[PDB]
């Protein structure tokens, strides 16, 4: 229901894998009263990528939650393709950049507020049997100082009816340093691996996105920065097999790190639920206040 001729390009907001998001104004009355929106498109409209995109659009459309970015509509020109996803525009950018920019005014209670919101959004995904597969502060957006939203769903898959995991191995880079061990070894993605990645998100938050402290930097320094191409993955697997883990971030209390390390359990079935993670984060945040 969005006509392409009324979307006015303003700037690029972000560039994902096979996708990009643009800040546009939807101004059908041509009087500069229309609203600014976010428009997602494919960088190269492959038939396979187009079918993935259609599934992503339906997934997002099916989601309604304070902590999930709002679907608004779709757009297409010159027939059916050039397909574009229209979403609400969130003015503070990604939580990665936002935390980096205000580290001296965002204290731990605020971090835990964001954490809780992320947990509740992920739990909502779970009730729909959706596996996000790409949890990272770079894929959390900031609506305002009090609200974050899960921001991108390009890698989200729906669980089979009969199984609690989805086996997929895609070409491209994969965010290996947020991957559960069973995702690196068997391409198995589950709620439990989303929980692992959430552990990494919590690490990210408490590092305040410091340069040398990113999961890639830390993990490369634990395996050796020389490590060569695909060998990287292999060593990562071995490192995680021997319970090598990201270190406790500077200033991070013991209980928060413990939440992280319980998320980083090699035994998929021993990782906590998102509801319990929310419960615990909320108890800590209420104790701090
Ligand atoms: N998530 C996220 C990260 C990132 C890219 C991930 C893959 C493609 C985009 N990205 C998303 C925005 C954005 N910014 C403001 N409003 C928005 N609405 C909807 C998105 C969006 C900016 N960069």
Curated annotation (Swiss-Prot):
Residues 7-282 form the Protein kinase domain. It comes from the Eukaryota. Autophosphorylated, leading to regulate its activity. Autophosphorylation on Tyr-26, Tyr-124 and Tyr-130 in response to growth hormone (GH) are required for maximal kinase activity. Also phosphorylated by TEC. Phosphorylated on tyrosine residues in response to interferon gamma signaling. Phosphorylated on tyrosine residues in response to a signaling cascade that is activated by increased cellular retinol. Undergoes Notch-induced ubiquitination and subsequent proteasomal degradation which is mediated by ASB1 or ASB2, the substrate-recognition components of probable ECS E3 ubiquitin-protein ligase complexes. ATP binds at residues 13-21, 40. Ubiquitously expressed throughout most tissues. The active site is at 134 (proton acceptor). It is found in: Endomembrane system; Cytoplasm; Nucleus. The modification Phosphotyrosine is found at residues 26, 124, 130, 165-166. Signal peptide: none annotated. Non-receptor tyrosine kinase involved in various processes such as cell growth, development, differentiation or histone modifications. Mediates essential signaling events in both innate and adaptive immunity. In the cytoplasm, plays a pivotal role in signal transduction via its association with type I receptors such as growth hormone (GHR), prolactin (PRLR), leptin (LEPR), erythropoietin (EPOR), thrombopoietin receptor (MPL/TPOR); or type II receptors including IFN-alpha, IFN-beta, IFN-gamma and multiple interleukins. Possesses 2 protein kinase domains. The second one probably contains the catalytic domain, while the presence of slight differences suggest a different role for protein kinase 1. It is linked to Chromosomal aberrations involving JAK2 are found in both chronic and acute forms of eosinophilic, lymphoblastic and myeloid leukemia. Translocation t(8;9)(p22;p24) with PCM1 links the protein kinase domain of JAK2 to the major portion of PCM1. Translocation t(9;12)(p24;p13) with ETV6. Budd-Chiari syndrome: A syndrome caused by obstruction of hepatic venous outflow involving either the hepatic veins or the terminal segment of the inferior vena cava. Obstructions are generally caused by thrombosis and lead to hepatic congestion and ischemic necrosis. Clinical manifestations observed in the majority of patients include hepatomegaly, right upper quadrant pain and abdominal ascites. Belongs to the protein kinase superfamily. Tyr protein kinase family. JAK subfamily. Interacts with EPOR, LYN, SIRPA, SH2B1 and TEC. Interacts with IL23R. Interacts with SKB1. Interacts with STAM2. Interacts with IFNGR2 (via intracellular domain). Interacts with LEPR (Isoform B). Interacts with HSP90AB1; promotes functional activation in a heat shock-dependent manner. Interacts with STRA6. Interacts with RHEX; this interaction occurs in a erythropoietin (EPO)-dependent manner. Interacts with ASB2; the interaction targets JAK2 for Notch-induced proteasomal degradation. Interacts with MPL/TPOR. This is Tyrosine-protein kinase JAK2. It comes from Homo sapiens.
């Amino acid at each position: 229901q969005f006509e392409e001729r009324h979307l006015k390009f303003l700037q690029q907001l972000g560039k994902g894998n096979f996708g990009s998001v643009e800040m546009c104004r939807y101004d059908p009355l041509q009087d500069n009263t229309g609203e600014v929106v976010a428009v997602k498109k494919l960088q190269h409209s492959t038939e396979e990528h187009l079918r993935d995109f259609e599934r992503e659009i339906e997934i997002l459309k099916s989601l309604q939650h304070d902590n999930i970015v709002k679907y608004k509509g779709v757009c297409y020109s010159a027939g059916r393709r050039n397909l574009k996803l229209i979403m609400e525009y969130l003015p503070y950018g990604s939580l990665r950049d936002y935390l980096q920019k205000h580290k001296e005014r965002i204290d731990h209670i605020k971090l835990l507020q964001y954490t809780s919101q992320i947990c509740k959004g992920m739990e909502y995904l779970g009730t729909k049997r959706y596996i996000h597969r790409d949890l990272a502060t770079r894929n959390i957006l900031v609506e305002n100082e009090n609200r974050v939203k899960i921001g991108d769903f390009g890698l989200t898959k729906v669980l089979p009816q009969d199984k609690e995991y989805y086996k997929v191995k895609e070409p491209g880079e994969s965010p290996i340093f947020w991957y559960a061990p069973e995702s690196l070894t068997e391409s198995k993605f589950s709620v439990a691996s989303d929980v692992w990645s959430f552990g990494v998100v919590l690490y990210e938050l408490f590092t305040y996105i410091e340069k040398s402290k990113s999961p890639p930097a830390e993990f490369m320094r634990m395996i050796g920065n020389d490590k060569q191409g695909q060998m990287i993955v292999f060593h990562l697997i071995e490192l995680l097999k021997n319970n090598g883990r990201l270190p406790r971030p500077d200033g991070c209390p013991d209980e928060i790190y413990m939440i992280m390390t319980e998320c980083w359990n090699n035994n998929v079935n021993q990782r906590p639920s998102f509801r319990d993670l929310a419960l615990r984060v909320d108890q800590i945040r209420d104790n701090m206040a």
